[PDB]
Amino acid sequence: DVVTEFGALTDYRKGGVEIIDDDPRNYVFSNVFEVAANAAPYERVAVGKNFEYVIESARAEGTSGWFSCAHDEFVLAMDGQIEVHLLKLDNSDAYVDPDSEGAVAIGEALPEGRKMGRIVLRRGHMALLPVGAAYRFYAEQPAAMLFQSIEGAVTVQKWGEICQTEA
């Protein structure tokens, strides 16, 4: 009977690079669950990067501070229930430079603006994080998530510690 295998923070099975004639560091190989497993709550660790564009892996745990961004972002839930809260900022320019890129951490205090909505994501669920909204997360238990964004102020880079270096 059909079993489709998904990973989880507590259950993943990392693969890797076998070398015929090459260097494994060319393939920048990591597992997003291992990365989120080893990170601080809500720490946004780059796991993919193509020029300025990044994919960040994070472990949601408890309530995050608020974030805003000068461009759209997307969040994909990879394992565990994660609640997203959206707020339409009165003056987004007061929190985020409309010329910066990448998420900005705008603090624990409720920014000024109107309640936009609430989203609850489970594994495999993707949400829009729209430009001009601030967003926060809540996760009762540790949950894995991924961001589609741009390298910026919240983006942690630690390629040497996350990727395969030997074969």
> CA 114, 144, 123: angle at the middle one, nearest 5?
80
Using CB under 8 A as the binding rule, whether residue 148 contacts other proteins is answered as yes
Phi/psi at 42 (5° precision): 60, -5
**Which residue lies nearer to other proteins by CB, 103 or 106?**
103
Residue 107 in the binding site for other proteins (CB under 8 A): no
What distance lies between CA 81 and its chain's CA centroid?
Answer: 14
Q: Does 6 bind other proteins (CB under 8 A)?
A: yes
60 in contact with other proteins (CB under 8 A) = no
CB of 33 to other proteins, least distance (A): 4
Judged by CB under 8 A, does residue 97 bind other proteins? Answer: no
Of 130, 118, 117, 124, nearest to 144 by C-alpha is 124
Using rule CB under 8 A, residue 99 touches other proteins: no
Which part of the chain contacts other proteins (CB under 8 A), choosing from 29-37, 60-68, 91-99, 104-112?
29-37
The span from the CA of 63 to the CA of 36, in Å, is: 16
